[PDB]
Structure formats: C-alpha cells, structure tokens
Amino acid sequence: LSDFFTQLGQDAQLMEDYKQNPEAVMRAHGLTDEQINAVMTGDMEKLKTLSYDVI
Amino acid sequence: GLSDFFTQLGQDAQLMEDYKQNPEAVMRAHGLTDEQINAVMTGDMEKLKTL
Amino acid sequence: GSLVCVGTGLQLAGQISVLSRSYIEHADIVFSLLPDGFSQRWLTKLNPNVINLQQFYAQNGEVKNRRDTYEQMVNAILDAVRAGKKTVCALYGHPGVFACVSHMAITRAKAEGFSAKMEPGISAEACLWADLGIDPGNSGHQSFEASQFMFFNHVPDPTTHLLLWQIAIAGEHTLTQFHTSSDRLQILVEQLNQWYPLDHEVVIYEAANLPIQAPRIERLPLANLPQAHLMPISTLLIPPAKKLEYNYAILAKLGIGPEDLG
Amino acid sequence: GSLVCVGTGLQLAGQISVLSRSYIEHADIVFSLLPDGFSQRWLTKLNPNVINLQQFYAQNGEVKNRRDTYEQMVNAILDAVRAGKKTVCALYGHPGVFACVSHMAITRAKAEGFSAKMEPGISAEACLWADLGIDPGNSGHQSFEASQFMFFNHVPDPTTHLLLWQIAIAGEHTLTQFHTSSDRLQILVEQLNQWYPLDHEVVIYEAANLPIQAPRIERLPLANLPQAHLMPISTLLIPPAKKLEYNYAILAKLGIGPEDLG
Ligand SMILES: Nc1ncnc2c1ncn2[C@@H]1O[C@H](CSCC[C@H](N)C(=O)O)[C@@H](O)[C@H]1O
Numbered sequence: 001l002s003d004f005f006t007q008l009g010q011d012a013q014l015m016e017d018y019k020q021n022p023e024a025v026m027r028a029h030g031l032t033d034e035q036i037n038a039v040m041t042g043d044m045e046k047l048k049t050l051s052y053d054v055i
Numbered sequence: 056g057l058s059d060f061f062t063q064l065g066q067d068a069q070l071m072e073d074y075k076q077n078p079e080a081v082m083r084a085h086g087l088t089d090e091q092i093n094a095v096m097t098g099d100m101e102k103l104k105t106l
Numbered sequence: 107g108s109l110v111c112v113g114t115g116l117q118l119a120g121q122i123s124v125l126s127r128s129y130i131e132h133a134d135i136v137f138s139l140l141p142d143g144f145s146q147r148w149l150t151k152l153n154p155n156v157i158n159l160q161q162f163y164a165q166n167g168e169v170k171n172r173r174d175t176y177e178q179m180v181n182a183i184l185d186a187v188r189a190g191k192k193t194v195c196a197l198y199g200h201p202g203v204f205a206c207v208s209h210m211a212i213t214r215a216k217a218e219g220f221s222a223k224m225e226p227g228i229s230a231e232a233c234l235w236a237d238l239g240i241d242p243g244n245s246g247h248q249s250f251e252a253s254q255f256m257f258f259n260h261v262p263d264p265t266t267h268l269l270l271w272q273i274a275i276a277g278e279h280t281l282t283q284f285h286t287s288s289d290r291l292q293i294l295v296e297q298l299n300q301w302y303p304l305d306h307e308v309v310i311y312e313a314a315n316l317p318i319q320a321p322r323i324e325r326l327p328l329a330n331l332p333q334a335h336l337m338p339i340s341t342l343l344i345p346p347a348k349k350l351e352y353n354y355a356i357l358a359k360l361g362i363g364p365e366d367l368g
Numbered sequence: 369g370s371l372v373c374v375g376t377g378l379q380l381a382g383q384i385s386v387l388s389r390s391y392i393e394h395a396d397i398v399f400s401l402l403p404d405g406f407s408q409r410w411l412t413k414l415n416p417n418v419i420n421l422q423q424f425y426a427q428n429g430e431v432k433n434r435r436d437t438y439e440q441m442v443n444a445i446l447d448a449v450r451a452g453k454k455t456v457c458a459l460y461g462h463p464g465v466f467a468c469v470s471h472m473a474i475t476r477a478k479a480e481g482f483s484a485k486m487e488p489g490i491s492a493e494a495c496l497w498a499d500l501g502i503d504p505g506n507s508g509h510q511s512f513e514a515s516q517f518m519f520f521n522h523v524p525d526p527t528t529h530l531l532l533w534q535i536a537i538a539g540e541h542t543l544t545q546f547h548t549s550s551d552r553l554q555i556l557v558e559q560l561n562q563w564y565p566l567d568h569e570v571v572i573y574e575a576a577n578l579p580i581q582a583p584r585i586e587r588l589p590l591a592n593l594p595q596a597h598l599m600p601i602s603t604l605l606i607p608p609a610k611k612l613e614y615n616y617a618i619l620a621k622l623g624i625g626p627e628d629l630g
C-alpha cells in the first residue's frame with residue numbers, strides 16, 4: 001500500500017493513469033479488494049489499519 | 056555556464072550549503088568570471104541577466 | 107551545526123519542493139512532524155535518521171499544556187544543532203504558517219550563534235485556494251486562529267474570504283484538550299453573527315493527505331457549525347457576506363469615478 | 369485534452385513541488401509565465417514545447433488593457449486543450465494566488481467538458497513569512513490588492529500583519545500602465561493614515577528569484593512610501609499598529625478571564 005501511494009503522489013504519469021481508471025491501476029499495483037473498497041468509499045481510517053494540534 | 060550553475064544551485068542542497076560556506080570559491084570552481092562574481096556579490100541582477 | 111526548517115506540503119511525497127527534499131536527503135538528522143504513517147514511511151526511506159516530534163505530545167490521557175510540548179520540541183531540535191549536527195526540521199505544510207516550533211527554533215539557534223533558516227512550503231491555505239477555485243486577491247483574504255479571534259478583539263472585513271484556523275479547538279483556553287465543545291462553537295456563532303447571518307453558508311475544508319483521497323469541502327449554514335464533525339486538520343472558511351462597494355471618497359481624490367475603472 | 373495549472377515557486381528550479389515538476393515533464397505542451405530568462409531556460413530543458421504567455425502583454429508602448437492580455441492568455445491555453453493536447457500552464461509562485469489566468473482557464477475548460485485542475489504552489493506570501501520570520505497566525509493576516517483597497521471599501525484590522533499586493537501600480541485605474549505615480553501613493557498613505565501613523569514602519573519585500581540573490585527587506589516609515597523605488601514584484605507589508613487586546617464580552621460568556629488563558 002505505502003509503496004503505491006508514494007509513487008502515485010510523486011509521479012504525474014501514474015497520477016493521470018490513476019484518474020483515468022482508478023480500479024484498474026490499483027489492481028495492477030496489487031491492492032486487495034478491501035483496500036480498493038476503502039479507497040472508493042474514502043475510509044482513510046481503514047487504509048491506515050490495513051497498512052500540529054495548535055500553532 | 057551561468058544559467059547551468061544557478062539551476063544547479065537552486066535544486067541541490069549540498070551545493071547550496073557548499074555555496075553558503077564559501078561563495079567565491081564555489082563560483083570560481085564552476086567557471087564564473089570575475090565580472091559575474093562581482094555582479095553576484097553586489098547584487099546587480101541587471102548585469103547578471105546581461106552576462 | 108546548523109538548522110534548516112522545511113515543509114513537506116499536505117499531500118504525500120509529491121508536494122514537497124525539490125530543494126526541500128534535497129535538504130532532508132543530505133541532513134545529519136531529521137526531526138519530523140507529519141500527518142500520518144504513510145508520510146512517515148516516505149520520510150524514513152529518504153533519510154533513516156529521523157526523530158519523531160510526535161513523542162512530545164501529551165500521551166495517555168495525561169494533562170499537558172501544548173506550550174510545554176512545543177518547548178520540548180524546540181529544545182530537542184536545538185540539542186542536535188548544539189551537538190554539531192547538520193539538522194533539518196521537516197514539518198507538514200509550510201513550517202512557519204500557524205506553527206511556532208520552527209520560528210522558535212530558528213530564533214534560538216540564531217541567538218546562540220548557529221546558522222538557521224526557514225524554507226517556505228505549501229500550506230493548507232495554499233491547498234484551499236486551489237481546491238475551491240478561489241483566489242485570495244479576488245476580494246481580499248483574512249486569516250485568524252479561531253481561539254485568538256474569540257479571546258482578543260479582531261474585526262473581520264465581511265467582503266473578504268475569511269479563514270478561522272484550528273476551528274476544532276475554538277475557545278479551548280487551557281490548551282490541554284484535543285477538541286473544544288459544542289457550547290463554545292455556539293458562542294463563536296453568536297460572535298460571528300455581528301457580521302454574518304445565521305444562514306450564511308460556510309465551508310469546512312480539509313485538504314487531502316493521500317493521493318487517493320478527495321478533499322473535504324462541506325458546505326453548511328453558520329448556525330449548524332456547533333453540531334458539525336470537526337477534526338484537528340479542519341479549517342473553517344467564511345465566504346464574503348458582501349460584495350465590493352465603491353470607495354467614492356478615494357475615487358474623488360484620484361479624480362475618477364466608477365465607470366472610469368478599467 | 370486536459371488542463372493542469374501548476375506553480376514553479378519564486379526561486380529558480382528548486383521551489384516547484386516534486387509532483388508539479390513531473391506534470392511539466394510529461395505534458396504535451398506548456399504555457400509559461402516565469403520571472404526571468406534563467407527560469408525560462410530551466411523550463412525549456414524540462415520540456416521543449418513551451419509557449420511563453422509573456423508575448424500577450426503590451427509590446428512597444430502600445431495602450432492595452434491588462435484584461436485583454438489575460439483573455440488572450442486564457443484563450444491560447446484553451447485552444448491547446450480543445451485541440452486534444454494534455455496541456456500544462458506553469459505560472460510562477462502559486463498559480464491561483466493573485467492570478468486570474470489559471471482560474472479563468474480552469475473555469476472555462478470545465479464548462480466545455482474538459483478535465484481541469486490546479487496544483488498549489490509556493491507563493492510570494494509563503495516566502496515572506498519565511499524570510500521575515502513571521503507566522504501569519506501570531507496576530508492574524510490580511511491580504512488585499514493595493515488598487516482594490518483604494519477603489520473599494522476595505523477596513524483593515526491593525527492588529528494583524530497586513531499585505532498590499534501589486535503596490536507598484538496602486539491606484540493605476542486604467543490597467544494600461546506598468547507603474548503608478550507618487551501622487552497616487554500619497555493618496556494611499558493618507559487613506560492608510562486612518563489606521564496607521566505616518567511614522568509607522570512598513571516593509572517593501574521582494575522574494576529572491578535566484579539562489580545567489582538576497583531578498584529585498586526594505587524598512588521605511590509609511591510617510592516615505594511615495595518616494596520609494598517600487599517594482600512589479602514588490603509587496604508592501606504593514607506590521608500591526610496595535611497590540612492584541614482582551615475580548616471581555618466573549619471571555620465572560622466563556623466564563624474565564626485573561627488569567628485563565630493557557
Ligand atoms: N489538511 C488540512 N486541511 C485544511 N487545514 C489544515 C490541514 N492541516 C492543518 N490545517 C490547518 O492548520 C491547523 C494546524 S496549524 C499547522 C498548519 C500547517 N503549518 C500548514 O502549512 O497548513 C489546523 O487546525 C487547520 O486549521
């Protein structure tokens with residue numbers, strides 16, 4: 001998971017690939033179905049599971 | 056020459072910290088002329104764009 | 107030793123500047139304060155000599171003033187500098203935007219004779235303009251920390267885009283709790299009612315930290331704020347209540363009028 | 369085709385974000401607006417298919433409204449998108465901070481059915497906090513465009529750090545000239561005197577564009593502003609005129625006082 005996210009955040013090729021077809025890119029990088037489901041529902045808590053407070 | 060060095064320096068924190076310790080030595084070692092170095096030390100951006 | 111404080115942006119890995127990443131890479135030691143564990147893994151691959159400033163926050167229900175937390179962060183940073191280490195502080199976003207640790211560290215380092223500097227980063231405010239398609243220049247921009255807006259006398263310009271940072275702890279005067287209360291937020295709404303109607307639409311904004319994550323852009327009337335789900339990363343945006351009106355006094359001094367404006 | 373608007377920061381080469389540099393690299397075509405020729409050379413090595421938006425500014429003394437300049441920039445960007453090109457606009461600093469071209473291009477692209485987005489960048493404001501060691505959160509922050517501050521009704525909070533952008537054209541109502549006049553700046557000084565004394569110290573700030581260049585941090589009383597040497601890249605910072613004062617009405621509703629503040 002962490003490997004994919006770090007690549008995706010840095011690589012504008014991959015980023016535009018991901019936006020075209022998120023599920024296909026995520027499957028192609030090995031993400032599980034629960035990991036993909038976590039992404040498509042926006043559940044960041046489960047994603048961290050699966051892997052300043054004041055001025 | 057000049058444009059190479061500036062792009063070089065703006066991106067490379069090693070070279071940036073090398074430059075901060077000894078600006079003249081780093082600038083000479085990267086081929087800057089005395090007029091180019093003088094422009095840098097007096098802050099004359101007009102002249103740097105000329106050169 | 108020396109000190110450079112950088113920001114890493116809000117998004118994982120890609121929102122740090124090229125120079126700032128290079129500073130992290132080449133550092134003797136890094137003191138971090140990052141939004142999550144994905145960001146922390148990325149940093150440790152960049153440079154394995156990381157000391158997490160998170161450890162100095164109150165642990166395990168324990169009561170701790172956040173100013174004592176920051177002091178310990180600042181002191182830990184300066185210890186590495188005083189020892190002789192080429193030290194980098196890697197904070198999320200912009201290290202000097204609503205964040206005191208780096209400013210205090212740089213002031214202290216400079217006073218003890220050490221080289222210290224701050225490299226600007228991409229802050230949550232910068233993310234908001236892009237995510238919401240708002241230019242702060244359109245009708246102006248005001249930022250305040252929410253609690254300072256309550257504790258002290260600030261007058262907002264209701265024609266601007268107004269930001270209240272750290273809205274989730276608005277009114278939490280002890281600086282020992284992670285969140286405020288709904289009655290505190292109701293007092294904020296009544297205070298804000300001097301300038302904004304109760305049905306005025308505001309936006310709870312949260313910039314995304316991961317590249318698979320959409321930002322939070324939640325629109326709601328101002329009256330409903332005390333019932334809303336707020337997080338420490340939440341910023342409250344209050345759009346203008348009022349459109350720009352002509353300043354005839356100055357236009358006359360300039361010898362022009364409205365339909366002369368280009 | 370599609371549209372991504374990025375920023376390159378203020379400093380040469382190193383202040384662009386890692387992702388934003390990658391967007392430029394992989395683009396079909398880039399439309400640029402950069403501070404100088406060193407920045408332009410750096411961009412052309414990243415991606416040789418660059419169209420310089422500078423061409424659309426008034427050339428050779430011609431009378432031209434800046435609004436027609438920006439329209440032509442927006443239209444040129446959209447033409448590449450409509451043709452089918454994966455298009456990037458690379459503006460200096462933050463592309464949506466006191467800059468209309470990218471916001472207008474994205475709005476127009478979205479309405480014609482094209483994917484358009486804005487990536488935040490490091491703006492001149494972000495550079496100022498770092499260069500001056502000022503946190504916008506300390507006592508709050510206000511930004512206005514200088515001419516809008518004159519032409520329309522804005523009330524500044526004199527406890528905040530106040531910024532007037534594009535100070536060099538303050539009061540230039542036609543948007544056909546590159547600079548204003550000292551009589552206009554004197555009218556601004558008199559307007560500002562409602563809140564700031566004539567001997568109030570202000571700062572003319574210019575972030576550096578080159579890595580061998582120090583920033584401009586020129587301190588002067590407000591009265592001397594009309595005689596000062598201003599450039600298009602100059603921003604006027606006006607530090608607080610008043611200290612923060614306690615807001616007794618709200619503190620009482622909160623049931624606390626000054627001595628209880630953490
Ligand atoms: N992801 C995010 N989205 C929106 N606002 C955020 C945010 N993360 C932090 N903030 C704002 O910043 C406050 C913490 S102060 C730290 C700010 C950070 N230096 C920056 O550059 O943005 C939060 O209370 C919130 O108001």
Ligand SMILES: Nc1ncnc2c1ncn2[C@@H]1O[C@H](CSCC[C@H](N)C(=O)O)[C@@H](O)[C@H]1O
Nearest residue numbers: 461462466491492533534574575601602603
């Ligand atoms: N190098 C610089 N230092 C300080 N302010 C600057 C600057 N370059 C541009 N500005 C400010 O921005 C105005 C032009 S509008 C462009 C702003 C740019 N998008 C940014 O991110 O900053 C100038 O009039 C000035 O007020």
